[PDB]
Amino acid sequence: SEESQAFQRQLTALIGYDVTDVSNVHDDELEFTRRGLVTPRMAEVASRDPKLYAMHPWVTSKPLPEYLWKKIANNCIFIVIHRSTTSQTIKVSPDDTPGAILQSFFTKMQDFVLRVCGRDEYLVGETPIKNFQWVRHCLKNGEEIHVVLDTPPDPALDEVRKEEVSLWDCDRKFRVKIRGIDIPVLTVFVEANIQHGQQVLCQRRTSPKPFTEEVLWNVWLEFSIKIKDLPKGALLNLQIYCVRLLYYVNLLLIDHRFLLRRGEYVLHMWQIFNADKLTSATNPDKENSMSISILLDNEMPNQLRKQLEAIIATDPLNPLTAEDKELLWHFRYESLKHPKAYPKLFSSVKWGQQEIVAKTYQLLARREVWDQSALDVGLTMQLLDCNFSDENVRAIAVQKLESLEDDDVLHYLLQLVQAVKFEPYHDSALARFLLKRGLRNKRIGHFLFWFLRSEIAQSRHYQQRFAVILEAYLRGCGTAMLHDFTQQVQVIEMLQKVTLDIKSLSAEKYDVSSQVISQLKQKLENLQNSQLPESFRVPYDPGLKAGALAIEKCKVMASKKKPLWLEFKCADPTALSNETIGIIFKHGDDLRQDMLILQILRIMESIWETESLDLCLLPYGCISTGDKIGMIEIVKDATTIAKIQQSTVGNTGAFKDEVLNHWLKEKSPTEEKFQAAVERFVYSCAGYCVATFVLGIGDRHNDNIMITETGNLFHIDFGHILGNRVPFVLTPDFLFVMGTSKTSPHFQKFQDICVKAYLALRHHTNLLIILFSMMLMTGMPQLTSKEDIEYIRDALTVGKNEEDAKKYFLDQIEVCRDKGWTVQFNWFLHLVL
Numbered sequence: 001s002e003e004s005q006a007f008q009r010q011l012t013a014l015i016g017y018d019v020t021d022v023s024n025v026h027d028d029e030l031e032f033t034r035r036g037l038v039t040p041r042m043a044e045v046a047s048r049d050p051k052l053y054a055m056h057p058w059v060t061s062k063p064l065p066e067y068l069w070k071k072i073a074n075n076c077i078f079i080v081i082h083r084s085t086t087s088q089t090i091k092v093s094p095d096d097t098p099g100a101i102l103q104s105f106f107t108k109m110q111d112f113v114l115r116v117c118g119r120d121e122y123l124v125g126e127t128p129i130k131n132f133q134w135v136r137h138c139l140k141n142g143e144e145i146h147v148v149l150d151t152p153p154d155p156a157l158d159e160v161r162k163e164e165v166s167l168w169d170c171d172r173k174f175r176v177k178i179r180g181i182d183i184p185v186l187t188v189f190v191e192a193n194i195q196h197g198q199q200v201l202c203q204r205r206t207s208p209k210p211f212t213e214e215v216l217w218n219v220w221l222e223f224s225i226k227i228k229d230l231p232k233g234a235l236l237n238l239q240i241y242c243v244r245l246l247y248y249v250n251l252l253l254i255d256h257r258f259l260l261r262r263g264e265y266v267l268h269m270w271q272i273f274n275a276d277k278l279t280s281a282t283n284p285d286k287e288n289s290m291s292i293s294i295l296l297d298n299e300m301p302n303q304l305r306k307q308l309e310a311i312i313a314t315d316p317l318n319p320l321t322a323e324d325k326e327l328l329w330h331f332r333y334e335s336l337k338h339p340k341a342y343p344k345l346f347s348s349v350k351w352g353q354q355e356i357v358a359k360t361y362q363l364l365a366r367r368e369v370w371d372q373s374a375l376d377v378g379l380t381m382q383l384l385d386c387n388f389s390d391e392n393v394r395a396i397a398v399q400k401l402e403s404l405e406d407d408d409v410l411h412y413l414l415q416l417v418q419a420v421k422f423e424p425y426h427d428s429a430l431a432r433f434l435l436k437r438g439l440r441n442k443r444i445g446h447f448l449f450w451f452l453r454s455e456i457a458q459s460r461h462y463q464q465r466f467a468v469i470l471e472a473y474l475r476g477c478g479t480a481m482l483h484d485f486t487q488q489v490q491v492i493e494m495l496q497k498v499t500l501d502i503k504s505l506s507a508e509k510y511d512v513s514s515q516v517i518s519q520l521k522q523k524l525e526n527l528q529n530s531q532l533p534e535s536f537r538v539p540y541d542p543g544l545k546a547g548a549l550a551i552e553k554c555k556v557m558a559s560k561k562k563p564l565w566l567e568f569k570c571a572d573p574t575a576l577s578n579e580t581i582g583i584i585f586k587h588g589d590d591l592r593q594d595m596l597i598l599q600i601l602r603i604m605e606s607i608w609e610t611e612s613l614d615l616c617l618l619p620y621g622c623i624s625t626g627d628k629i630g631m632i633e634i635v636k637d638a639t640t641i642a643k644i645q646q647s648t649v650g651n652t653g654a655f656k657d658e659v660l661n662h663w664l665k666e667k668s669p670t671e672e673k674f675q676a677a678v679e680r681f682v683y684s685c686a687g688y689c690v691a692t693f694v695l696g697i698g699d700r701h702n703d704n705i706m707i708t709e710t711g712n713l714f715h716i717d718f719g720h721i722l723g724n725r726v727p728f729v730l731t732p733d734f735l736f737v738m739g740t741s742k743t744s745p746h747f748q749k750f751q752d753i754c755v756k757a758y759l760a761l762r763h764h765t766n767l768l769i770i771l772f773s774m775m776l777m778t779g780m781p782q783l784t785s786k787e788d789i790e791y792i793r794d795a796l797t798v799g800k801n802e803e804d805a806k807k808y809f810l811d812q813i814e815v816c817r818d819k820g821w822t823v824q825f826n827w828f829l830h831l832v833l
């Protein structure tokens with residue numbers, strides 16, 4: 001229909017990709033997936049509470065932190081309620097449901113709901129107020145809980161549109177006819193590898209022929225694998241060699257319909273590990289890319305129990321030898337009693353053997369131990385990586401994810417969305433899981449949209465698959481969100497244009513012009529006049545709605561990339577703050593890497609949360625919105641650590657100790673408040689000391705480090721260092737705020753938090769190892785070597801004794817004392833040659 005044809009154009013503009021495009025496919029896999037996803041989409045729309053979906057209560061069932069329980073002069077805590085300048089503070093119990101406070105209103109002074117002042121965050125549902133995320137945020141910040149007596153938002157605004165083995169198999173060895181290669185404009189050979197979970201089952205090469213625009217072979221490449229032995233999820237990896245790899249392409253030997261791939265194929269190749277090297281998608285640039293023409297016509301002993309128990313224990317990056325694999329496979333029923341052995345056991349399977357594969361499925365039936373076990377995110381995710389191409393293995397991991405509460409989904413989301421790059425087929429248990437969790441909760445859904453949209457907008461390798469998952473979501477989120485994302489995209493597209501034009505205007509030559517700041521205000525006034533939405537939603541903080549720009553407050557930052565500095569008025573008039581919303585728009589670096597580091601930082605804070613530690617990290621908002629471009633959060637009242645040095649000193653290099661504490665006393669209204677800033681610095685520094693070290697992003701210029709007037713420290717621009725000696729940034733100016741020029745009471749405390757922190761991350765070695773190895777593979781293609789991945793092993797000191805490693809970190813701190821300003825001076829010198 002005419003109104004159905006227009007709905008798809010609204011989807012296309014939102015997605016950033018035309019999903020109804022068949023000009024780059026050799027099968028109907030994406031269409032089979034659009035169609036396949038219709039049922040889990042309609043099933044989650046129909047299953048969700050309309051009243052609770054509309055209000056998206058953000059809650060946790062995690063035990064209330066020990067540090068935060070102490071914040072209350074226990075048992076009865078007070079919160080402020082508003083309703084037309086009628087504001088009364090009410091003492092409420094932490095175990096009180098919102099309704100208990102709602103019916104306490106009739107007694108104090110239903111048809112109305114408790115909403116937070118300034119943001120779209122309702123305190124609703126049958127949950128104790130201690131379990132609401134906003135309340136916990138306010139407690140820790142030393143901030144007053146302010147709510148307004150709003151009315152419940154209409155679930156009718158969330159209105160949804162109505163509309164929607166293998167048998168070619170025989171004993172014969174598998175063969176593929178390589179006809180030749182063609183590019184529009186040494187010697188060249190083609191490599192044919194049968195891959196399953198990165199493990200090469202069989203490898204065959206061609207006779208090298210002279211390098212020409214049309215190379216022909218007409219050769220049949222018979223493999224050692226029988227047609228019957230081919231496992232579903234296996235890839236035919238075609239690679240072109242000089243000995244250097246030039247081009248590569250993949251083709252899924254078994255269909256999404258379980259059919260062996262028979263026929264003539266002209267595959268457009270990708271030009272030169274990386275997750276992009278795994279893609280089933282062909283190159284869209286059919287005009288410039290090389291193509292490949294192909295044809296397809298077809299009781300246990302103690303000494304040994306000690307050995308596999310030692311294997312079970314070794315980290316996710318320790319390789320298994322044939323000895324280990326054979327042992328694991330033979331004593332597989334024992335290995336099944338230990339859930340932390342499943343990644344090792346499933347990597348001991350001979351996937352190129354139907355017999356072994358069937359036995360693995362027989363072994364999978366007796367999942368009793370696996371299912372009854374407590375969900376290990378580090379173990380679950382380990383089975384979703386590149387080493388696992390089996391659908392049934394991947395599903396048992398996706399099964400454990402079904403038990404994550406919306407709080408923990410939102411937490412591992414980016415990495416679960418990235419884990420989709422490891423799936424053999426477009427339709428998968430994981431893709432579906434992500435769809436259900438998103439369609440169910442607006443916060444999971446809002447983030448899902450941008451997370452998918454970032455990859456769609458800058459990867460020709462996975463945009464097709466990701467675009468399909470997005471259309472499926474967009475069709476079930478509702479008209480409210482469908483309108484809400486529309487105004488978010490309109491604002492981003494306009495601003496991104498402004499960002500690139502102003503980057504072009506500025507020379508790149510160190511300093512910024514008066515006419516550049518004038519042209520910005522002039523271009524912002526043209527956007528503000530008309531076309532730009534009256535109000536929109538902040539993509540990194542969906543709670544906050546941004547109204548109209550503060551054109552006078554907007555400027556162009558004095559950096560080599562020339563980013564935008566934008567201030568926005570809050571759309572809410574209940575904003576009990578004057579404060580504008582500050583967003584930085586920047587073209588230059590891949591903010592997909594900042595996004596990743598920022599997410600692990602959020603994980604480390606949660607790891608510390610369980611050990612009752614708050615290390616005051618500041619993982620600010622950041623969304624990659626397109627090719628080498630995106631938006632960033634402005635952390636209010638913060639300044640560059642180098643800019644504080646550049647103030648007193650005025651120029652590069654001298655660097656005085658006291659300067660830091662000088663600015664701290666300068667920017668603290670009371671010495672009684674300065675004592676709290678000293679306290680906030682001592683562990684906000686400790687947090688970033690540990691974190692950056694573990695992730696190997698500790699060697700950074702003091703320009704890339706910031707501090708608030710309240711003394712909270714934070715590292716910035718992570719993609720800058722990732723697009724390329726000391727352990728971390730601990731400098732004499734920081735050591736001066738502690739009282740060390742030697743030991744002091746604060747520096748003693750710094751090390752104590754550092755040791756308690758480095759050891760707390762170590763109790764989660766395997767989680768951090770998979771998150772890191774996955775992050776490098778799916779996000780940063782520069783650092784995708786065996787050696788780059790293995791950094792987290794040495795950093796976390798795997799296998800080392802708890803006391804022996806506690807010394808390794810205290811020794812690392814001493815390398816900072818050894819080298820006071822040695823490389824901070826070298827960095828300052830380097831960034832000016």
Ligand SMILES: COC(=O)c1ccc2nc(NC(C)=O)sc2c1
Pocket residue numbers: 584586620632633634635636637638639716717718
């Ligand atoms: C590339 O810059 C960043 O990543 C970044 C992150 C946070 C941040 N917060 C800032 N705050 C202020 C007040 O300058 S500037 C800034 C910059």
